[PDB]
Design an enzyme around this catalytic site. Structure first.
Site, PDB file in Angstrom:
ATOM      1  N   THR A  16       0.822  -1.199   0.000  1.00 10.69           N
ATOM      2  CA  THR A  16       0.000   0.000   0.000  1.00 10.69           C
ATOM      3  C   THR A  16       0.864   1.260   0.000  1.00 10.69           C
ATOM      4  OG1 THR A  16      -1.325   1.341   1.553  1.00 10.69           O
ATOM      5  CG2 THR A  16      -0.375  -0.722   2.410  1.00 10.69           C
ATOM      6  N   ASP A 125      -4.078  -9.239  11.670  1.00  9.95           N
ATOM      7  CA  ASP A 125      -4.292  -9.574  10.266  1.00  9.95           C
ATOM      8  C   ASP A 125      -3.664 -10.916   9.867  1.00  9.95           C
ATOM      9  OD1 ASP A 125      -5.524  -9.266   7.831  1.00  9.95           O
ATOM     10  OD2 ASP A 125      -3.939  -8.032   6.976  1.00  9.95           O
ATOM     11  N   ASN A 130      -0.027 -13.549   4.700  1.00  7.77           N
ATOM     12  CA  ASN A 130       0.844 -12.870   5.658  1.00  7.77           C
ATOM     13  C   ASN A 130       1.728 -13.805   6.486  1.00  7.77           C
ATOM     14  OD1 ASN A 130      -0.043 -10.355   4.785  1.00  7.77           O
ATOM     15  ND2 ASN A 130      -1.625 -10.191   6.377  1.00  7.77           N
TER      16      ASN A 130
HETATM   17  N1  LIG Z   1      10.312 -11.122   4.070  1.00  2.00           N
HETATM   18  C1  LIG Z   1       9.631 -11.530   2.976  1.00  2.00           C
HETATM   19  N2  LIG Z   1      10.061 -12.570   2.219  1.00  2.00           N
HETATM   20  C2  LIG Z   1       9.376 -12.976   1.122  1.00  2.00           C
HETATM   21  N3  LIG Z   1       8.233 -12.398   0.695  1.00  2.00           N
HETATM   22  C3  LIG Z   1       7.700 -11.344   1.361  1.00  2.00           C
HETATM   23  C4  LIG Z   1       8.385 -10.842   2.562  1.00  2.00           C
HETATM   24  N4  LIG Z   1       7.655  -9.811   3.021  1.00  2.00           N
HETATM   25  C5  LIG Z   1       6.598  -9.665   2.192  1.00  2.00           C
HETATM   26  N5  LIG Z   1       6.627 -10.570   1.193  1.00  2.00           N
HETATM   27  C6  LIG Z   1       5.608 -10.725   0.124  1.00  2.00           C
HETATM   28  O1  LIG Z   1       4.961  -9.471  -0.148  1.00  2.00           O
HETATM   29  C7  LIG Z   1       3.588  -9.509   0.287  1.00  2.00           C
HETATM   30  C8  LIG Z   1       3.219  -8.163   0.911  1.00  2.00           C
HETATM   31  O2  LIG Z   1       4.025  -7.822   2.046  1.00  2.00           O
HETATM   32  P1  LIG Z   1       3.311  -7.546   3.477  1.00  2.00           P
HETATM   33  O3  LIG Z   1       2.154  -8.504   3.615  1.00  2.00           O
HETATM   34  O4  LIG Z   1       4.396  -7.500   4.526  1.00  2.00           O
HETATM   35  O5  LIG Z   1       2.752  -6.027   3.353  1.00  2.00           O
HETATM   36  P2  LIG Z   1       1.304  -5.542   2.786  1.00  2.00           P
HETATM   37  O6  LIG Z   1       1.531  -4.164   2.207  1.00  2.00           O
HETATM   38  O7  LIG Z   1       0.239  -5.681   3.837  1.00  2.00           O
HETATM   39  O8  LIG Z   1       0.967  -6.583   1.592  1.00  2.00           O
HETATM   40  P3  LIG Z   1      -0.527  -6.877   1.040  1.00  2.00           P
HETATM   41  O9  LIG Z   1      -1.146  -5.515   0.826  1.00  2.00           O
HETATM   42  O10 LIG Z   1      -0.297  -7.652  -0.236  1.00  2.00           O
HETATM   43  O11 LIG Z   1      -1.174  -7.689   2.140  1.00  2.00           O
HETATM   44  C9  LIG Z   1       3.468 -10.709   1.229  1.00  2.00           C
HETATM   45  O12 LIG Z   1       2.178 -11.343   1.249  1.00  2.00           O
HETATM   46  C10 LIG Z   1       4.541 -11.650   0.709  1.00  2.00           C
HETATM   47  O13 LIG Z   1       3.993 -12.528  -0.284  1.00  2.00           O
HETATM   48 MG   LIG Z   2      -0.012  -8.358   3.709  1.00  2.00          MG
END
Ligand SMILES: Nc1ncnc2c1ncn2[C@@H]1O[C@H](COP(=O)(O)OP(=O)(O)OP(=O)(O)O)[C@@H](O)[C@H]1O
Ligand SMILES: [Mg+2]
Ligand SMILES: [Mg+2]
Lengths: 295, 258
Positions: A16, A125, A130
């Site tokens: 986001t 969440d 996640n």
């Molecule tokens: N440390 C990591 N290693 C591998 N993949 C990751 C990692 N962190 C995040 N990702 C990938 O990126 C996606 C989004 O990161 P995260 O969930 O931390 O933030 P977000 O902005 O809430 O994402 P979303 O809006 O897609 O839920 C995760 O669902 C995962 O697939």
């Molecule tokens: Mg996420």
């Protein structure tokens, strides 16, 4: 730690603020995830995510390695995990995920969550997207963007929490107080999902979500859940479904697994099992750490 | 009560030592004084009133300020800017609906611009290395309240009022940990309202006794007694409200019988 040492490899997620990149540390070789946050100032979600992540060091919680904090950009450096649980389940579409792996993953998740709860952090969440898995059989809680530091006892926190499918009934019914029990509900939904490979309660609205829960667990009354009929969004018009036999909820699950699931999906947040207590459930007597059977 | 009550208390006791500002920082500050700090904190109390912020938000903001000033010299004309960024940070951390940045620029009587507030926010974060989840007196009090027999709204509000008063005066209160200040405030509230004392279930929980609390308690007692004559009055005003059962109108005990 600074951006010159890192070499972007590929994009691995959309957020986001909000682009997650796989990157390589050119000097150490360490593979990392770079979460970029665009800069009302620094967003409250990043403020909480960073402060809370810095306190949480546990093998089943994603590691925040560094914060690169400049003029217009904030870069969060995380340990890289190969895949999230949602994609993993998709790749195992036909012919399933072995019970020993599910058990191991659940055991690890409960460890991570109990650590969170012990350090006064609500995740808020938990869902398969996640949760991150590596090739060595580890699974870790990730995305602390909705997390918060809670107090003892809790006061009223943000209402609009937990994505719908994994949202607990006390949130749906509008209780002024929710606490650690909401993360356990989500984990119970995920446990069921790993077994059946479909979401347990996939509603498209709040009322739809409640009714799906009610058809599986029975419509809650004062007996099963004292106070429920006094709750803000409770309606006496609610249809009154009978609770169903749990062997029919997740058929492949044996007696210990069903016992644990029923305790994670208890209506009354007070009676719902804690992550800490759940680690000692007989379901885990034979727990090992299998490697994920895939890539 | 829940699980985690003991684990959480233990963790907060560890973190309060790590989040503690430097006891003697004001001596090393060339341009600001304890008195100017009292004026800032009192103003923050007013800000908290105006926007209906949680008491926790206030306690957090003061913790951020004291830690910032533990390593950063600041000119008197800049203290309020540090305070404003700190209250902004506390709000984003703690509040369901924090006030907008424009609103924080507004309450400074146009002393500073929006860009100044935002740049100071950044700097505060760097100096604190984003470590914002600090234990407060407030977080200890709510845990101690669970040991009341039975619960008493007047005791709770008065203890909150006394804990809040300690925020104003860096001398002597910077030398006490939040769990200690909370101990003293809770005993003093309990004694004032019901005549009861620090309960032995809290001795078991905290390891603190009236003996170990006495130094803080003697200071807090004097602060309570002298409260109506203090230059800063926003806390006393605040706690006249029915929201806090008008506890600022209760009469302090003349002696503690120790
Ligand atoms: N440390 C990591 N290693 C591998 N993949 C990751 C990692 N962190 C995040 N990702 C990938 O990126 C996606 C989004 O990161 P995260 O969930 O931390 O933030 P977000 O902005 O809430 O994402 P979303 O809006 O897609 O839920 C995760 O669902 C995962 O697939
Ligand atoms: Mg996420
Ligand atoms: Mg000085």
């Amino acid at each position: 730690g600074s951006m010159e040492n890192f070499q972007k490899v590929e994009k691995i997620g959309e957020g986001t603020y909000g682009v997650v990149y796989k990157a390589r540390n050119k000097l150490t070789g360490e593979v990392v995830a770079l979460k970029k946050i665009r800069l009302e100032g620094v967003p409250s979600t990043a403020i909480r995510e960073i402060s809370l992540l810095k306190e949480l060091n546990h093998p089943n919680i994603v590691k925040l390695l560094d914060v690169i904090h400049t003029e217009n950009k904030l870069y969060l450096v995380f340990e890289f995990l190969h895949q999230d649980l949602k994609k993993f389940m998709d790749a195992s579409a036909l012919t399933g995920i072995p019970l020993p792996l599910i058990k191991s993953y659940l055991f690890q998740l409960l460890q991570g969550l109990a650590f969170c709860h012990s350090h006064r952090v609500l995740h808020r969440d938990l869902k398969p997207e996640n949760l991150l898995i590596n090739t060595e059989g580890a699974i870790k809680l990730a995305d602390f963007g909705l997390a918060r530091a809670f107090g003892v006892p809790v006061r009223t926190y943000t209402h609009e929490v937990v994505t719908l499918w994994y949202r607990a009934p006390e949130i749906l019914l509008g209780c002024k107080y929710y606490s650690t029990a909401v993360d356990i509900w989500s984990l119970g939904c995920i446990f069921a999902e790993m077994v059946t490979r479909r979401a347990l309660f996939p509603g498209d609205s709040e009322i739809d979500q409640l009714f799906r829960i009610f058809r599986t667990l029975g419509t809650p009354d004062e007996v099963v859940w004292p106070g429920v009929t006094s709750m803000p969004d409770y309606k006496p018009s609610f249809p009154k479904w009978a609770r169903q036999d749990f062997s029919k909820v997740v058929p492949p699950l044996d007696e210990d697994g069903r016992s644990l699931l029923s305790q994670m999906l208890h209506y009354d947040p007070n009676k719902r099992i804690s992550a800490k207590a759940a680690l000692a459930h007989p379901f885990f007597q034979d727990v090992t750490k299998p490697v994920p059977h895939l890539r | 009560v829940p699980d985690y009550h003991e684990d959480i208390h233990t963790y907060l006791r560890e973190m309060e030592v790590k989040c503690k500002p430097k006891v003697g920082y004001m001596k090393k500050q060339p341009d600001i004084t304890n008195s100017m700090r009292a004026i800032l904190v009192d103003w923050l109390v007013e800000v908290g009133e105006e926007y209906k912020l949680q008491n926790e938000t206030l306690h957090l903001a003061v913790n951020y300020i004291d830690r910032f000033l533990s390593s950063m010299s600041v000119l008197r004309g800049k203290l309020q800017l540090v305070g404003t960024a700190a209250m902004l940070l506390a709000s984003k951390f703690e509040e369901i609906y924090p006030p907008e940045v424009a609103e924080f620029v507004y309450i400074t009587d146009d002393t500073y611009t929006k860009k100044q507030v935002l740049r100071m926010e950044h700097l505060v974060l760097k100096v604190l290395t984003f470590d914002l989840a600090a234990p407060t007196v407030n977080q200890f009090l709510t845990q101690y309240f669970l040991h009341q027999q039975p619960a008493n709204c007047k005791v709770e509000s008065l203890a909150m009022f006394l804990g809040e008063l300690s925020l104003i005066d860096a001398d002597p209160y910077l030398k006490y940990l939040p769990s200690v200040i909370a101990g003293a405030a809770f005993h003093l509230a309990l004694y004032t309202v019901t005549g009861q004392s620090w309960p032995e279930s809290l001795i078991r929980k905290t390891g603190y006794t009236l003996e170990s609390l006495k130094p803080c308690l003697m200071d807090l007692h004097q602060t309570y007694l002298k409260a109506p004559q203090h230059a800063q009055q926003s806390i006393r005003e605040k706690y006249k409200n029915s929201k806090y059962h008008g506890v600022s109108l209760l009469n302090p005990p003349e002696t503690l019988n120790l």
